[PDB]
Amino acid sequence: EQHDLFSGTFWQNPHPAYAALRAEDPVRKLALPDGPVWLLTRYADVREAFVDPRLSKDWRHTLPEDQRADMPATPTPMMILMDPPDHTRLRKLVGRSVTVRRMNELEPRITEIADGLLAGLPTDGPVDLMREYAFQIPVQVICELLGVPAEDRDDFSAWSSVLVDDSPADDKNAAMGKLHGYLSDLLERKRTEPDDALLSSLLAVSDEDGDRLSQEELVAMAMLLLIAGHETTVNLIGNGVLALLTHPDQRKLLAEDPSLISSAVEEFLRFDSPVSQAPIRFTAEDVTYSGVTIPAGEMVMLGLAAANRDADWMPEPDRLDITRDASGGVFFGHGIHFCLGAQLARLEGRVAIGRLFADRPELALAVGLDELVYRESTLVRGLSRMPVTMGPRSA
């Protein structure tokens, strides 16, 4: 029987729609508002697709060859929108800065941010755990990462939380512009007053040939990190928290053994992937997956949330099991575009989710599951609000 796709019942719980697709319709054209897209839902296909060089990040493949004689490769100089060789250079340059130790140095501050939020939350409801906890953490973390001055945090938080869908892309189009101007100004200041944070680190990146990020490249990279790192992490927190609130057995296991948190975070990423579909790829030529040919010039979405529950990859994929091993999940992508922030996202997930459940052992949903309202956003598995009762702080 025909499950709604990206409409009606899908938004509250897409997983049965995904399971029916994997089984009976694994390469499926679906009509979306701005354009039709092809959806690949099987694990092996999604994984193959991520390394398929015929699947490009360049939108100009939607144009006939003689009509590309006008258009730029990219709307903004953003690495995620590029193929090699241009991607390879930008990835190389940002990877000089985004280091293992840099990500870890942030851990005490992530803990601080999370503890401060938890302390200001009331015991008796209702509280929206999204607006009040989940929404707040990742941008304050990005602020720490980048070296946004403390005076500017609240302002920067205001402007970026606009990007996380509230009103139409008119004042968001202007929020982008203000963020762009602000960061461009900041990069200026960092050049003469260097510090230990990411923006000044990126400015000085100078490879073996003298190559470096241009002023425009720097600003687009900064904006990318913000956009890639905010909403995604927010929904990791929300979805991971929900997973524990809806599985008392798994929450018990975490409570008894807090060190399971790292394993739990991988399992929440698998079980209810916050980036539900990868950003759109474009067919540079015809491709065939599961006997279905997608013609050249089409838009293709890799179903990460579907692939992560594919029984041909993970046995008992509909069971939540925090002791399980993550190995092979596609929630952070695969191949050349693999999430640049995956270590930080994982760190923020474990801190945010682990400290929450430590501080509030009696945390509970304040509505039924059938009353939860999900964002209607193609690429996102994200709660718009999560009503909860926090309960007493642990002694």
| Nearer to ligand HEM among residue 274 and residue 303 (C-beta) | 274
Q: At what angle do helices 172-192 and 153-163 cross, to 10 degrees?
A: 140
Q: Retrieve residue 260's tokens.
A: 């399971």
CB of 225 to ligand HEM, least distance (A): 5
In the three-class reduction of DSSP (H, G, I as helix; E, B as strand; rest coil), residue 364 is classed as strand
Residue 9 DSSP symbol: G
Give the β-pairing of 299-302 and 36-40.
parallel
Instruction: Give residue 294's Cα distance to chain centre.
Output: 26
CB of 252 to ligand HEM, least distance (A): 25
CB of 71 to ligand HEM, least distance (A): 20
CB of 192 to ligand HEM, least distance (A): 25
Instruction: Give residue 335's Cα distance to chain centre.
Output: 16
Indicate whether 236 belongs to the interface with ligand HEM (CB under 6 A). Answer: yes
Pick the stretch among 1-9, 22-30, 228-236, 293-301 that binds ligand HEM (CB under 6 A).
228-236
Give the β-pairing of 127-128 and 387-389.
antiparallel
Indicate whether 307 belongs to the interface with ligand HEM (CB under 6 A). Answer: no
Q: Out of 187, 205, 275, 390, which residue is the one contacting ligand HEM (CB under 6 A)?
A: 275
Q: Measured between alpha carbons, how far is 207 from 364 in angstroms, rounded to an integer?
A: 51
Indicate whether 282 belongs to the interface with ligand HEM (CB under 6 A). Answer: no
Pick the stretch among 273-281, 357-365, 371-379, 380-388 that binds ligand HEM (CB under 6 A).
273-281
Q: Measured between alpha carbons, how far is 165 from 33 in angstroms, rounded to an integer?
A: 16
Are residues 54 and 285 in contact, defined by beta-carbon separation less than 8 angstroms? Answer: yes
CB atoms near residue 335 (< 10 Å):
11
Q: Cα 306–309–313 angle (5° rounding)?
A: 115
Indicate whether 278 belongs to the interface with ligand HEM (CB under 6 A). Answer: yes
Residue 243 DSSP symbol: H
Q: Out of 77, 238, 317, 333, which residue is the one contacting ligand HEM (CB under 6 A)?
A: 333
Indicate whether 205 belongs to the interface with ligand HEM (CB under 6 A). Answer: no
| Nearer to ligand HEM among residue 30 and residue 342 (C-beta) | 342
Indicate whether 279 belongs to the interface with ligand HEM (CB under 6 A). Answer: yes
Q: Measured between alpha carbons, how far is 235 from 383 in angstroms, rounded to an integer?
A: 7
CB of 154 to ligand HEM, least distance (A): 20
Q: Out of 74, 157, 160, 232, which residue is the one contacting ligand HEM (CB under 6 A)?
A: 232
Are residues 245 and 393 in contact, defined by beta-carbon separation less than 8 angstroms? Answer: no
Indicate whether 239 belongs to the interface with ligand HEM (CB under 6 A). Answer: no
Q: Measured between alpha carbons, how far is 44 from 11 in angstroms, rounded to an integer?
A: 25
| Nearer to ligand HEM among residue 351 and residue 390 (C-beta) | 351
Question: 193-196 long-range CB contacts below 8 Å, 24 or more apart?
Answer: 195/147, 196/147
Kindly determine how many residues on this chain lie close enough to bind ligand HEM according to the rule CB under 6 A: 23
Restricting to residues 90-109, which ones interact with ligand HEM according to CB under 6 A? 91
Q: Out of 118, 322, 340, 365, which residue is the one contacting ligand HEM (CB under 6 A)?
A: 340
Q: Retrieve residue 150's tokens.
A: 């403390």
CB of 308 to ligand HEM, least distance (A): 11
| Nearer to ligand HEM among residue 97 and residue 384 (C-beta) | 97
* Closest alpha carbon to 277 in 9, 30, 8: 30
To the question of whether residue 143 is assigned a binding role by annotation, the answer is no
Indicate whether 80 belongs to the interface with ligand HEM (CB under 6 A). Answer: yes
Q: Out of 110, 163, 225, 353, which residue is the one contacting ligand HEM (CB under 6 A)?
A: 225
Q: Measured between alpha carbons, how far is 46 from 310 in angstroms, rounded to an integer?
A: 11
Indicate whether 332 belongs to the interface with ligand HEM (CB under 6 A). Answer: yes
Q: What is the rounded end-to-end Cα distance, in angstroms, of the chain? A: 51
Instruction: Give residue 394's Cα distance to chain centre.
Output: 31
Q: Out of 5, 17, 46, 79, which residue is the one contacting ligand HEM (CB under 6 A)?
A: 79
Annotated binding site: 339
Please report, as ranges, the residues that interact with ligand HEM according to CB under 6 A.
79-80, 91, 224-225, 228-229, 232-233, 236, 274-275, 278-279, 331-333, 337, 339-341, 344-345
Annotated binding site for heme: 339
